[PDB]
Every structure is written in structure tokens, then in C-alpha cells.
Ligand binder design. Structure first.
Ligand SMILES: Nc1nc2c(ncn2[C@@H]2O[C@H](COP(=O)(O)OP(=O)(O)OP(=O)(O)O)[C@@H](O)[C@H]2O)c(=O)[nH]1
Ligand SMILES: Nc1nc2c(ncn2[C@@H]2O[C@H](COP(=O)(O)OP(=O)(O)OP(=O)(O)O)[C@@H](O)[C@H]2O)c(=O)[nH]1
Ligand SMILES: Nc1nc2c(ncn2[C@@H]2O[C@H](COP(=O)(O)OP(=O)(O)OP(=O)(O)O)[C@@H](O)[C@H]2O)c(=O)[nH]1
Lengths: 48, 438, 427, 105, 178, 32, 427
């Protein structure tokens, strides 16, 4: 199936881990993204 | 970032705080030692705990709460407990002398020389933190040490820090049960002192906590452990928005701005619908519709109030678990059509929905149910003035015969402060009437 | 050549853009990594309307994300196409909104407008010549109203010669969640009518009804709601990027769409929404398209002008059609629907056809409407203020922010105007 | 507390299973001119001048029947046997039944 | 025609400023058009307006006081009521609608499109803070077809100004007709 | 002063003005 | 081209259209799946009179189903040809009726007439030029009487220019099961005579006797009764779909059928009905066809016109017949009973011959009759109404709905006027 409207079928199966991290932050007195290595929702791997 | 600090004043307010922290470590899998397994979550203190615990390079999750008490008995006991290695020794403030249920004894006699030490703690906690949305004040109006000592500290933290929120949680006095006849004295004393500073004060009553215990949980003989388990779940639910995300995320600032209509009165009531026995959950089914009725069923409110005698202003529901927008919006539409639900006409809208994907879990050796769909119901209605109205005639009779005054005038007060609080209260009821007059 | 730079505002727009931008990339066939897979020359040529070039065949989106809450932007960064979005373009603040219009309009906006203006002008100088700008936010959105009303004002003097497209969603009339949500609306729309030239009005209840009416699938995701509006907003942009004998400029459109200056609010219309069996139970023909295009159910914005009458109508057709079926169906819909339109203007039909079909369906279309159905909207909006400003509920905050009751009074007097304007012109 | 527009089928007792009609609703308003002044101080305290519903609300024999054809004397009593009960005529979910019938000859 | 016809009713009569219109012959206007004023009220009017500017009935105040003049505020948004107090308090040229007969001319223009002229003022970057340059006020007037003569200008300067140039606030101007 | 040319009614006013309005069954059709 | 859109009304018509349409599908040779099997050309061109085109050679029926009780449709939908019927065309209500006419005419139809009107005008615009509409319903059928009387009152003003065919079954004279059934009848007929142009009259007792007479199969299914009658409307519609020198238009027929406006009620007549052994004991000859065609036992509608006389007669012949045999047989019957006709009009015979025989038999015919045999019908009900409106039994319900006796007084003399009329012309 293509990505057409109504064809979006979410992965709604058992999802018990839902932890969130803080990919971005502030530090010192400027603002940036905190250390790149970060798991996602429930420990998700990033892109590559 | 997104973090807050908890305070537990009074030996009544300490054991409930321990249970909350005991609850908190389970959902994070905190070992009692203070360290995780070989799994990697430690660092400079940045993960789900970063809002709750301080697990620095030392590797020990440090709870962001300060326990203050005036008697060494119970406070040392937790220092000899199971998680005491987690806790900071002099964060667990102790005292050597009590206030003897006297508001002013804790407010004047001992409180002066201890708050400065406490003021050292908060600033040394203030420097390390970053986001500091607000505070979690756990106390009790009829506090032998909770009442008086909290009043001074909340004053001092208000004047130096007035740019951030402060969340108050106290056991409401039992309407028909009195373990102390002086408890009303300081209770009105506490209320009048806190009216001009406090942001959001939430009350609870143990009698109804026991009432629900044998109603659906079917325990004729529960314990504080169960009682603290329920309230610890309650504060856990409200902190899920902090600790998780959901379909939409909300913050205490949104709560305060939207819950309180007008100044002074900031006294909402909490309710949690999926309170059911394990077996009753076993062969039955849960969905938004029925839990919405149960949380709106008048006997499920934890305070001795009839909503049919009052009228609604604020209503807030926090759906933690597996829910969808379709049924809930359809469901809440039904209540808007309901006739018994008598909101004040000033607000066509008085509902605040929070959706959280995470199903609440069970605690080992616990008594709760298997919650997939959860909702914590925070609401404010006009049916509350009866409790204060119960207090004043309770208060006025003993004041008329000035019972126990010789203690208070004996150790350094006069009737002026006791005089002022009553018209402060008398203002409340007529204001409560005038606001009830739509 | 002429380009468009986008602004992502408010948390809805964070969800809106994420779905909208993945649609564009997947429509044009760029992989999530960014290495375009050359399959269509026309999309290869007309990528410069919206994207610039990075090294190694990377088509950097010319959109700007602004927010205050990291978790939303952390999530979308972890979303399917956060990698194609720029931390350079990730601008946000160190503050919590409180869903407060005034804080994001006077307090928090002051120290962030400087940087965001730098970001856009850097993007503005990066490109050659813009048509204008399009804006995704909500009118009932707590901070999106706060930022946008500030930004639109600043852009007005900055570039008063461009298109200030605004895309906002009308919150649910029956159910508002936020109780100060109305207050935010009149605060915003007061400046919006002053500053905007185009405004899309969208409501979620119709979206639930349409998912009810044609999606058939009971429980959707809000992303699917984003997914359909992203399709609609893409259709109006297909004109610009795609060939075919259709004139694409929004100014081309707006001058044919706007008879008088105060007309900024418009309703959309879309093409086949199909059910499980009707995919093979539909004879795909322009007449039954034209029927479905003009359906009291097919609308999604506010409600049927069945209450009122029709001022201006413009329909864009995307696929392999011909000038005659649109003409005769226009004649059909003319003879069938003639006097419902205002006798003020006859033949106010505006038709364009995009010969390039979408990827997945062939005979498709989009409709944009300006009829006399917005009265009920700000009529609906009217009462609660007169109800809640009757007793200034939840007002001590805004006075604490430094606001006055007076500012509301011109805002409502401004809308009290537009009620008569919509009334007097049509009635 | 208003009724919506157009799509007037998605919210009815058809789903509520309501057996006492919710509330009368409408879609209409006279164009309200008015500065919408404030007549409260900090509490919804009406300025003593402005009027309100002055303490009107503050905080079995009735049944749905058609008179049809039952002896008038009994029928006459029934009407009285329905009414004169404001404890079931006024407020608190509505409390008011209906009636029908036809006279005798 | 509570504004137009009653205005036209006086414009039929012709005399000089102070000698507005004879009370006896203003009663001839009463027979020319029966007035909603009660008979007892009718008798005072011929003597409550002859007290000023000769025994001649003062339509000068009467006509405008009834409809044109409203020197107060309202509960119900008299088409704007912006808050403003700049030009009216000073008012060296105190209200004199005979001297200020331009008010009789301009109300037709403002009852037409008061809101656009209400809009027009703030469109000149007034900042919503008060007054605006007089010469700018001159050009806004004629540009919206409100042609006002130099002698009419001199009057409104006396009315909406006391000491020096000033910048005549928008609603402070508006509420005169509004 | 140029007098506006008497608008010549080569039908029109009679027919084509009324012909447009006459072949019209509207105010009726999608629904009340 | 001229087409027809069908209407399913009442729970009786729920059987009919299913049986009515399946015969047509089998007649035209469409499989239950819906893919036409090209075997006869003439059915291939002339299917568009009733069907539209769906994708993959599928022929969508142009019929509209409406009811209240969900169990009926699910059985119909689960029928052998429920698949060919459209979920879009499935319109219904969220209520049970109680078999109450006023509820189905005033209470429940209120929120459904809007929807059904949209569906039909969607279908009406889906087609170009209709001859009119035909309706399957009952006069004694509660929900059908409530719905149909409403729509026939409506479908007149929008389309006062089309054929408003009505197909209604008369309940059993001896017993009506439903006791409020006559109350439903009197209300329905009052509007029916005002609104309709055609009305078929059908009774089940005759069908029961016919089973005893020629079917001889003791225990049939009520579907067989539906299958028997479906042949009757099929034959009158074979005129339109099939070639052959017969003029087919029902208006062409109706003008030849209706001498005066209030003549709406007509009786049918069908051709060879053959018993167990007589299939090869019958010499299929137009004489014996004409003999059996004109048999009082072959009469099936209400009762024997033997009691009265004959106003107008029309027989359509389906098969390989010719000008001659239909002529002398018409001459034979004319000479047979010349006095049984009315002296008002001679040569009241109207003949049409369809050269295309049915699939299953070669020699066939269809007769439609208008005689003076309806008096006994409304005379019979007349005493019932006088007897039961004598003291208003079971009437508190209708007053509860809002009814009052004035509507009964107005309706009754309408029928009584027709009694004098039907009497006066012939007697
Ligand atoms: N917050 C809280 N209250 C409790 C608990 N158990 C009982 N209570 C009630 O809370 C009240 C305790 O107040 P206080 O006695 O003044 O507590 P205190 O000020 O810390 O000083 P003490 O006299 O030493 O207890 C009692 O009267 C009980 O009714 C508990 O576990 N937590
Ligand atoms: N993202 C998102 N927004 C929603 C959804 N449903 C309703 N909304 C509303 O859409 C509005 C637009 O979001 P934003 O413009 O980002 O809001 P904001 O100004 O940042 O502040 P808030 O409105 O308080 O959230 C929000 O206010 C929500 O109330 C949803 O499912 N997703
Ligand atoms: N479907 C069906 N209908 C039958 C059958 N036998 C008799 N009928 C009659 O057909 C009549 C017409 O059906 P409808 O017009 O749909 O009736 P209704 O409006 O649903 O209400 P009722 O007539 O009370 O059933 C009914 O009143 C039945 O009495 C049968 O075997 N099948």
C-alpha cells in the first residue's frame, strides 16, 4: 500500500516500554542538543 | 528542564512521602542500593529520574525531596529502613522537641532556629536544579508538627521565591472524627495564614479512603500502607504527565491557570475512578464510559460533600493508559447533556483532559487492580463550604468558652490572631455563597 | 524563480508539518535519508519551489520550526523525517506556555522574535524571490496564536509585497478543552484580520465526522487528521509545482477570490474519499466526482452554507481531465445551483485543472470556498465572551501580565463589525 | 449550552439512552450590542445596582397520561392529582411530565 | 427623520446665529410638524431655549442636543467608545453648534460609515495611545469624502483645541457625533 | 457633459436579462 | 435516454425488490457475484433503463431501500443478491416502528426524509431523464404507509412531471392480523388518491387459492408469492426493455387506461399458469392462452369483477405473437360478453405485443384491468371504520402521537365520495 490518507496503520501492538529522553537541552548559557546518543520512546534506535 | 521539589512536613506527612518515593522507584526499577543493573542509564543525572532523582557520576539516584520533622522517633526509623541509603541524611531533617499540636509552638518557638538550616537545603537544591516548575508540599492542617512548621516555611519560601508555583497536599480534617479538640484551633489558624500566599491546595479525608477500601476494594481491615498506597498512586498519576508523555502533555502552570477561577479559593477535589478490587476487575470490563460515570458518581468523591447540594466550577480528568479521542470526546459530550451535573452557568467549558498512553502498573505485595484505562478526576465545586461551616460552629463554641486558651496565651499569643481568622473565614462562606450566587 | 518558505508554529503545526513534509518527500520520492531516487523529471525540476540543495542530492526543506516545549520537537525529530529538518531551523524557548496568549505575545515573544527573524531572513537571503509565506498554527492554539500574531505583524512591514498565507484550525465548537481558549481567539483574530491576506479555517468535528462518514475505521490517529489536511494543503500547492494549463499563483487565485479586503476566511474541499467496498463500487467519472466535490458532507471546514449563500468558489482539478467536463459540470452545477449564489456576482466559478495526477489516485481535485457560512462561526464566538467577559473569569492573570480589559473591547468591536459586514453584504 | 449546526445527528439521546430530555437548545441570537462591562469586583460580586435572578434557585401521583375516555369526575381529579406539586414541577433534572386527552359528552 | 428632517426643518428657517428662530414661529414649526414633545414640555421648550441667544428658540442646542449631542458614555458600545481624554477637556471654543455648524454637516457623513472613519484614524499608526498630527487629521477628513471648509476648520480648532497645535485624539473627536 | 448613450435594448433587457433568470430552478435543489 | 429509479418501502417491499431484482439479474444473466455473462445482446443494450454501470462490467441496480427494523435488511443483505445492492442505498432508522402509521409519518420520518431525499436526488442526478418512479410497499403495511405517504407527498412538488407508480398490496379481507391495520389504510389511501397516478391492488388470499388451484403444491414459501408477483411487474416492464412493435411507455398506457383523474386502482392479469400434469396436456395456442388469460380463476388481484362491469382493459403479450391472433381473440371476447362492458365506451381493449419471449416459456402475456370490482373492497372496509370509529377503540395511542378525529372525518368521506363516484359512473 502507498502512503495515501486512510492507509496509515499505526503499529498498535503491545507497547509496554514508553520511556522518553531529553535529546535537546541548554547547557552553560547557550542552547544546543545534548549528547547525540539518545534512545527514543521506550528505548528506540535513531536513524543509522 | 522539567523538574520539581517535594517537601514533607510533620511526622504525619513523612510516611506518606516515603510511600510515594517507594512507589516511584518501582516504575523506574530503582534498586534499594541506589544503582541500576549493568544497564546504562547513569550519567550526569539525565534520564527519567532527572526530574525526580539525582543520579550523578556517583551513580546513586538522589530523591529530590526534603523530609522535615520535630521528633526523632519516626524520622530515624526510615533512616533505618530499606531505602535509607538512597536518602540524604540531613535532607531527612529531624527535631528534638515537638510543638504539642500547637501551631504557634512550631511557628515561633522552634521554627526560627531550624528554617535557616532548611533554607540552606533549598538554596543548595535551588543551585543544582534547572527548571524548578514548583514544589510538592505535603502537610496536615491538624498538624502536631505539620501545621505550625509548614506555615512559617511557606511564608519564607513565598517571599524569597514568588516567581514559581507551590503545590500543597494535606489531610483534610475528618468532619465527624476528632483525634484532638485543638485541631480545629490551628486548622483555622493555618487556613487564614495560607489564604494570601498559597497557589493550589488539595485536601483529602481518610474516612472516605477507608470507606472505598471495603466498598469495592473489599478490605474491611486495610492499613496505612494501603491508605498511603492510594494517595501515592494519586500523586503518581498527576506526575505521569511529568514522567511520561501522552497524546497531549500538560503542566502544573496550565492546571493553576485553569483550575482556580478567582483569588483566595484554590481548593479543588481529587477523585480516581478505576479503584476496584482485583477479582472485580478480573471478570468485568473497563472503558471510558463507565469510569466517567463512576468518577462522577457522588459517593466516589473522597470528601464528605454532596454535589447535588452544590454547583460545579472546575473539572479535570487525566486519562493515563490506553484510550482514544473518539469515545472520550463522545463520552464527555454525554455529561454535558446530563441534568444532575450542575455546573455554574459562567463556564460552558469547565473540563481539562490529559491523555497518557502509559497504563498504570501494579505494585508487588500491593492491593490495587490491573489498570489499563485510568482517570484522576480533579474538580472544584460549591459544595465545599459546609466543611468550613462545620468548623466555625465547632470553632465558635469552644472560643466562646475560650477552652485551652491559657496554654496559647500562656506561651505567647493573644486573641487578636484568633479574632482575625474568623472574619477571614466568615468572608469565605459569604464569598462562597456569593460565588454560588450565579 | 519564485519559492515559498514555511513556518511551523504551535504544537499542532508541529504535528501538521511533520505529516505535511513527509507527504511532500514521499510524493516526490525522496527516501527518509534524503538521497532522492530519480523517478519523475517534473518533480525533479520543480523541487526548487520549496526546497534548496544540500551536498549529495539532499533537498533541504525551507521550513522553520518554532516552539517552546522540547519534547514535541524531540518527538518530531525522532519522527520519520526529523533527519531532513535542521537544528539550525530548530528555534525554541526556555519557558513554559501556560497556554497563555499574553505571555507568548508580550513576555516570552520579546527575546525570541530577534532570533527567528534572523533565521527567516537568512533563509530569505538564501533564496532568490519568494511568492510569499504560508503559516501553520491554530487560532485557538495557546502559543501559536502568541508567536504568529507577533511574527505576522513584523513580517507585514518587512515584506508588504508578498503572500501572507495563514493556515489555522478552528477548535471544536461544542468542546473546547481549554477554557481560556476563546479569549486567545479574539486576541489573535483582532490582529489577524489586520495582517493576514489568506486564512484557512478548519474544524476537528467535521474531521471526526468525515472519518465517520467515509474512513469507516472508527478509531483513527490524530496524525491521520494531519494526514488529510496535509493532502488538502498539498493540492493547492500542486498548481505551483506541476505543469498543465492551469495558472497557479495564489495572487492569481486571491484576486479572483477576494472581492473586498476583509474577506480572508476560506473553506476547503477535496476529492474522492472512498470506503472499503466503494473503491470497486465507484465508476470514477467527473460527474460523480463533481457530485462528490459538491456534497454537504464532503466539506470539512465549519459547516454547510445551507444556512447562507455562496460568494466565491474555486475548484482545482488534479489529474487527466478536459475543459469540457469541468465546463458542463460547471454548467450542470450552474443550472442546478444558480440562485443560491449571491445575485451580487454571477459566474463567480473559478476552475483550474492540474493534468498531473497524484501518486496513488488519478482523477483527483481540491476545492476552496468563500461562502456565507462564517457568520455562525464568529456568532458562536460572540456569545461566550459576552458571557465570560460579563464577569471577567480567569482575568487576574492577564492583568498581571500587564493587559487591560480595554484591549478586548476593540477586538470584540472589530468582530462586531465583521458580523454586520458578513450580514450586510449578503443580507 | 447551545445546539450545533448542520450535522445535527451525531449528538442525540440515540446514543445517550436518555429517558428525560436533556435541555432545550437553539441556534439564534439577536446581535448583541454592548461594551460587556464588568459588574463584578473580584468574586462575581454583582454591583448592588445590577439585577440578577435574585435568590430564586440559590443552590407517585404525577405520571404521563392521556385523559382519553375515563369518567370526567375522575378525570378532573387526575389533573389536580397531577399538579399542585412544585416539588415535582420545577427544577433538579426538570421534574415535569406531560399530559393529553379529550373531553366528554 | 429625527436627524435629517428635523435638521431640514430648521434649514427652512433663515436668520443670523444669535437670532436662531422666534419661539412663536418655532411653534409654527410645531404646526408644520407635530412634535412628540408633550404640550407642557412644548411650552417650556420655547422658554427654556429663548433664555439663550435672544427670545428666538435655540435650535442651536435643541436639534443637536436631542440627537447630535451626547457628551457622556454608554453601557452598550456607542459604535466604539474607545477610552480617551485629550481634546475635549481643554476646549477653548466651548460647545456652540451655531458657531460649530460643521457638526450639522458632518454627522450625515459619519452616520454613513462611522466605523471606516473610526478605522481610518488608527490606520495612521496612531499606536492606540492618543492624539495624532492635526495636518494628518486634515488629510484623513477630506480623503474619505468628508469635505470640510477652512472656516469650519477654524471652528473645530477652537473646539477641539485650547492652547497650541495639539494632536486631537481619535475617539475624542469621534464621541462628539458618536 | 456627455449624456450616457440610451442603452440600446437589442432584446437583452427584455430577453437575455430575463433569459438568464428564467432557465433557473434554483433555491431548491440540494436540500432545504 | 429515459430511465427508472426504484424505491423499496415497507417491510413487505423488503421481500419484493430482492425477489424482483434477482429475477431481473437472472433474466439478464448476471451472476450473483455481479459480472455480466454476455449471452443475449438485447438485454445488453437495454439494461441501462434500470441499471447504471459499475466498474468491471458490474451493473448497479438503481433502487433505494429504507426500513426501520435492522434484522430485515441483514437477511436481505445476506440474500443471494444482497451484494449487488449498495451500502450507500441502505438508508434506515435507529428505531422500531411499533407498526404505527403516525410515528412513521410524523415522528420517526422527521429525521430520515432529509437523508432519503438526498440519496434519491443523488441517484436522480446520477441519471439523465427519468420516466418516473415505481414503489414497492403496502397500504396495510405500517412503516411503509408512514414512509411512502410522506415521500409521495414530497416527490410531487420537486418532480410533478414524472410517472409516480405505486405498487401496494391489499391485506387479507377475512383477517388483517394487525387490528389497527384499517386505521393505517384509511390515512394512507387519503393521500394516495391525491398523490399517485398509478396504483396496483394485490391480495394474498387469492394467491393462497391459486396455490390450491394451479400450483397444487400445498405448502409454498411466501417468497414464491413474491416470485409470482415479481413476474407481474416484470411483464409490464418487459415492454420498456424489449424491442417489438408494442408501445411501452406507462404514460402511453396510462392515458389509454385513465378516463378520469381519480382512477388510480388497477388489477393485474397473468398468463399460462399450469398445474402438475397439464404442461404436456396443454396445447399452447393463443385461443387457450386467451381463454386462460381471461379467467375469473386466473384473476388474482382483489375479487371477481363478475359482480360489476368492465371499464378499461389492457393485455400485453410477450412472445412470438402477431397482429391477427390478438385481434379475433379480442373480437371473440368482445362478442363473448359485449354487455358486460360499459356502454360508456366501446372497444376499451388496449393491446401491446412483446416479440421477445421470457427465458423459460415462449408464449406469455400480461394483463392490467380496471373494472367495477373495487366497490366491494372499500365497502368492506367502510363498515369496519364505522364500526371501530363508532367508539374509538385503540385511539389513545394516536392522540398521544398528536392525532385527532377531524383527520378521520375528512379522510372517510373522500373514500365515500369515491364510493358514489365508482357507483355513479357505472350505476
Ligand atoms: N498526613 C498524615 N496524617 C495522618 C497519618 N496517620 C494519621 N494521620 C492524621 O494526621 C494527624 C497528625 O497530625 P499531628 O499529630 O499534629 O502530626 P505532627 O504535627 O507531625 O506532630 P505529632 O504530634 O508528633 O504527630 C492525626 O491527627 C491523624 O488523624 C498519616 O500517615 N499521614
Ligand atoms: N498537536 C495537537 N494539537 C491539538 C490536538 N488536538 C487539539 N489540539 C489543539 O491545537 C492547538 C494548537 O497547538 P499549539 O498552537 O502548538 O498550542 P500552543 O500555543 O503551543 O499552546 P497550547 O494551545 O496551550 O497547547 C492546541 O492548543 C490544542 O488545544 C492534537 O491532537 N494534537
Ligand atoms: N416481509 C414480509 N411481509 C409480510 C409477509 N406476510 C405479510 N406481510 C405483510 O406486509 C406488510 C407490509 O410491510 P411494511 O409496509 O414494511 O410494514 P411496516 O411499515 O414495517 O409495519 P407493519 O405493517 O406493522 O409490519 C406487513 O404489514 C405484513 O403484514 C411476509 O411473509 N414477509
Amino acid at each position: 500500500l502507498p502512503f495515501l490518507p486512510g492507509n496509515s496503520f499505526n503499529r498498535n501492538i503491545g507497547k509496554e516500554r514508553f520511556h522518553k529522553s531529553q535529546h535537546w537541552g541548554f547547557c552553560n548559557n547557550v542552547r544546543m542538543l545534548v549528547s547525540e546518543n539518545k534512545p527514543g520512546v521506550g528505548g528506540d534506535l535513531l536513524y543509522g | 528542564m522539567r523538574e520539581c521539589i517535594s517537601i514533607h512536613v510533620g511526622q504525619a506527612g513523612v510516611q506518606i512521602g516515603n510511600a510515594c518515593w517507594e512507589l516511584y522507584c518501582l516504575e523506574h526499577g530503582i534498586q534499594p542500593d541506589g544503582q541500576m543493573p549493568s544497564d546504562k542509564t547513569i550519567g550526569g543525572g539525565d534520564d527519567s529520574f532527572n526530574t525526580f532523582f539525582s543520579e550523578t557520576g556517583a551513580g546513586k539516584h538522589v530523591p529530590r525531596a526534603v523530609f522535615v520533622d520535630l521528633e526523632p522517633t519516626v524520622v530515624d526509623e526510615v533512616r533505618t529502613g530499606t531505602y535509607r541509603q538512597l536518602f540524604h541524611p540531613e535532607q531527612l531533617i529531624t527535631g528534638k522537641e515537638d510543638a504539642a499540636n500547637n501551631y504557634a509552638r512550631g511557628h515561633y518557638t522552634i521554627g526560627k532556629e531550624i528554617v535557616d538550616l532548611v533554607l540552606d537545603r533549598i538554596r543548595k537544591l535551588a543551585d543544582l536544579c534547572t527548571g524548578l516548575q514548583g514544589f510538592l508540599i505535603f502537610h496536615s492542617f491538624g498538624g502536631g508538627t505539620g501545621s505550625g512548621f509548614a506555615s512559617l516555611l511557606m511564608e519564607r519560601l513565598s517571599v524569597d521565591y514568588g516567581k514559581k508555583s507551590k503545590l500543597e497536599f494535606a489531610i483534610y480534617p475528618a468532619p465527624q472524627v476528632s483525634t484532638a479538640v485543638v485541631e480545629p484551633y490551628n486548622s483555622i489558624l493555618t487556613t487564614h495564614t495560607t489564604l494570601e500566599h498559597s497557589d493550589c491546595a488539595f485536601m483529602v479525608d481518610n474516612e472516605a479512603i477507608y470507606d472505598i477500601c471495603r466498598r469495592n476494594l473489599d478490605i474491611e481491615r486495610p492499613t496505612y500502607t494501603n491508605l498511603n498506597r492510594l494517595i501515592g498512586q494519586i500523586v503518581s498519576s498527576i506526575t505521569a504527565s511529568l514522567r511520561f508523555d501522552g497524546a497531549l502533555n500538560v503542566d502544573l502552570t496550565e492546571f493553576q491557570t485553569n483550575l482556580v477561577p478567582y483569588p483566595r479559593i484554590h481548593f479543588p477535589l481529587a477523585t480516581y475512578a478505576p479503584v476496584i478490587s482485583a477479582e472485580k476487575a478480573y471478570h468485568e470490563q473497563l472503558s471510558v464510559a463507565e469510569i466517567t460515570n463512576a468518577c462522577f458518581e457522588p459517593a466516589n468523591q473522597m470528601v464528605k460533600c454532596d454535589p447535588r447540594h452544590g454547583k460545579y466550577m472546575a473539572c479535570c480528568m487525566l486519562y493515563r493508559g490506553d484510550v482514544v479521542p473518539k469515545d472520550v470526546n463522545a463520552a464527555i459530550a454525554t455529561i454535558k447533556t446530563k441534568r444532575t451535573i450542575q455546573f455554574v452557568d459562567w463556564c460552558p467549558t469547565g473540563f481539562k483532559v490529559g491523555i497518557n498512553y502509559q497504563p498504570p502498573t501494579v505494585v508487588p505485595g500491593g492491593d490495587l487492580a490491573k489498570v489499563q484505562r485510568a482517570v484522576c478526576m480533579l474538580s472544584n465545586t460549591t459544595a465545599i463550604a459546609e466543611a468550613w461551616a462545620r468548623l466555625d460552629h465547632k470553632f465558635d463554641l469552644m472560643y466562646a468558652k475560650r477552652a485551652f486558651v491559657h496554654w496559647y496565651v500562656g506561651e505567647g499569643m493573644e486573641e487578636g490572631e484568633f479574632s482575625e481568622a474568623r472574619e477571614d473565614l466568615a468572608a469565605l462562606e459569604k464569598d462562597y455563597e456569593e460565588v454560588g450566587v450565579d | 524563480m519564485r519559492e515559498i518558505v514555511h513556518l511551523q508554529a504551535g504544537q499542532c503545526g508541529n504535528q501538521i508539518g511533520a505529516k505535511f513534509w513527509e507527504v511532500i518527500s514521499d510524493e516526490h520520492g525522496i527516501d527518509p535519508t534524503g538521497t532522492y531516487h530519480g523517478d519523475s523529471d517534473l518533480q525533479l525540476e520543480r523541487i526548487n519551489v520549496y526546497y534548496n540543495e544540500a551536498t549529495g542530492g539532499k533537498y533541504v526543506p525551507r521550513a522553520v520550526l518554532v516552539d517552546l516545549e522540547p519534547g514535541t520537537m524531540d518527538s518530531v525529530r525522532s519522527g520519520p523525517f526529523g533527519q531532513i529538518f535542521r537544528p539550525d531551523n530548530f528555534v525554541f524557548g526556555q519557558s513554559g506556555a501556560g497556554n497563555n496568549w499574553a505571555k507568548g505575545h508580550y513576555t516570552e515573544g520579546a527575546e525570541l522574535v530577534d532570533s527567528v527573524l534572523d533565521v527567516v531572513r537568512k533563509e530569505a537571503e538564501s533564496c532568490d524571490c519568494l511568492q510569499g509565506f504560508q503559516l501553520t498554527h491554530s487560532l485557538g492554539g495557546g502559543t501559536g496564536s502568541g508567536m504568529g500574531t507577533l511574527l505576522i505583524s513584523k513580517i507585514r512591514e518587512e515584506y508588504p509585497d508578498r503572500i501572507m498565507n495563514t493556515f489555522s484550525v478552528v477548535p471544536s465548537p461544542k468542546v473546547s478543552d481549554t477554557v481560556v481558549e476563546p479569549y486567545n481567539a479574539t486576541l489573535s483574530v483582532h490582529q489577524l484580520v489586520e495582517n493576514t491576506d489568506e486564512t484557512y479555517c478548519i474544524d476537528n468535528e467535521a474531521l471526526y465526522d468525515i472519518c465517520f462518514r467515509t474512513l469507516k475505521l472508527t478509531t483513527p490517529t490524530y496524525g491521520d487528521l494531519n494526514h488529510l489536511v496535509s493532502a488538502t494543503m498539498s493540492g493547492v500547492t500542486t498548481c505551483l509545482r506541476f505543469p498543465g494549463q492551469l495558472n497557479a499563483d495564489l495572487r492569481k487565485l486571491a484576486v479572483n477570490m477576494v472581492p473586498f479586503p476583509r474577506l480572508h476566511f476560506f473553506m476547503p474541499g477535496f476529492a474522492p474519499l472512498t470506503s472499503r467496498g466503494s473503491q470497486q463500487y465507484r465508476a470514477l467519472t467527473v460527474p460523480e466526482l463533481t457530485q462528490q466535490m459538491f456534497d454537504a458532507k464532503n466539506m470539512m471546514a465549519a459547516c454547510d452554507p445551507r444556512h447562507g449563500r455562496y460568494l466565491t468558489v474555486a475548484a482545482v482539478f488534479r489529474g487527466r481531465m478536459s475543459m469540457k467536463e469541468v465546463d458542463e459540470q460547471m454548467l450542470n452545477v450552474q443550472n442546478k445551483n444558480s440562485s443560491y449564489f449571491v445575485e451580487w456576482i454571477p459566474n463567480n466559478v473559478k476552475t483550474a485543472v492540474c493534468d498531473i495526477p497524484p501518486r496513488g489516485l488519478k482523477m483527483s481535485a481540491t476545492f476552496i470556498g468563500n461562502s456565507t457560512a462564517i457568520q455562525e462561526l464568529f456568532k458562536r464566538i460572540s456569545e461566550q465572551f459576552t458571557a465570560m467577559f460579563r464577569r471577567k473569569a480567569f482575568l487576574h492573570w492577564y492583568t498581571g501580565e500587564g493587559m487591560d480589559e480595554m484591549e478586548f473591547t476593540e477586538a470584540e468591536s472589530n468582530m462586531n463589525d465583521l458580523v454586520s459586514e458578513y450580514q450586510q453584504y449578503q443580507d | 449550552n447551545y445546539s450545533a449546526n448542520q450535522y445535527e445527528k451525531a449528538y442525540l439521546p440515540t446514543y445517550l439512552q436518555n429517558w428525560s430530555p436533556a435541555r432545550p437548545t437553539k441556534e439564534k441570537i439577536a446581535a448583541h450590542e454592548g461594551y460587556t462591562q464588568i459588574i463584578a469586583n473580584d468574586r462575581g460580586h454583582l454591583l448592588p445596582s445590577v439585577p440578577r435572578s435574585k435568590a430564586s434557585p440559590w443552590g407517585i401521583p404525577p405520571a404521563k397520561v392521556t385523559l382519553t375516555a375515563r369518567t370526567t369526575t375522575a378525570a378532573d381529579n387526575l389533573t389536580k392529582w397531577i399538579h399542585k406539586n412544585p416539588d415535582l414541577l420545577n427544577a433538579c433534572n426538570g421534574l415535569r411530565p406531560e399530559i393529553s386527552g379529550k373531553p366528554f359528552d | 427623520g429625527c436627524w435629517r428632517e428635523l435638521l431640514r426643518e430648521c434649514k427652512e428657517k433663515d436668520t443670523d446665529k444669535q437670532g436662531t428662530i422666534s419661539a412663536a414661529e418655532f411653534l409654527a414649526l410645531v404646526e408644520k410638524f407635530k412634535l412628540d414633545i408633550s404640550r407642557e414640555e412644548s411650552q417650556q421648550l420655547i422658554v427654556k431655549y429663548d433664555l439663550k441667544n435672544n427670545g428666538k428658540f435655540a435650535y442651536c442646542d435643541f436639534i443637536q442636543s436631542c440627537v447630535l449631542l451626547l457628551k457622556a458614555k454608554e453601557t452598550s458600545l456607542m459604535r466604539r467608545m474607545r477610552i480617551q481624554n485629550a481634546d475635549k477637556m481643554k476646549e477653548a471654543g466651548m460647545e456652540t453648534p451655531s458657531f460649530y455648524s460643521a457638526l450639522l454637516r458632518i454627522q450625515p457623513k459619519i452616520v454613513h460609515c462611522w466605523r471606516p472613519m473610526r478605522r481610518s484614524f488608527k490606520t495612521y499608526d496612531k499606536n492606540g495611545t492618543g492624539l495624532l498630527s492635526v495636518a494628518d487629521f486634515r488629510k484623513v477628513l477630506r480623503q474619505y469624502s468628508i469635505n470640510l471648509s477652512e472656516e469650519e476648520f477654524f471652528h473645530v480648532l477652537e473646539y477641539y483645541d485650547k492652547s497650541l497645535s495639539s494632536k486631537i485624539s481619535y475617539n475624542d473627536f469621534l464621541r462628539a457625533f458618536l | 457633459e456627455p449624456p450616457q448613450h440610451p442603452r440600446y435594448t437589442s432584446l437583452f433587457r427584455a430577453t437575455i436579462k430575463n433569459d438568464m433568470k428564467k432557465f433557473k430552478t434554483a433555491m431548491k435543489t440540494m436540500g432545504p
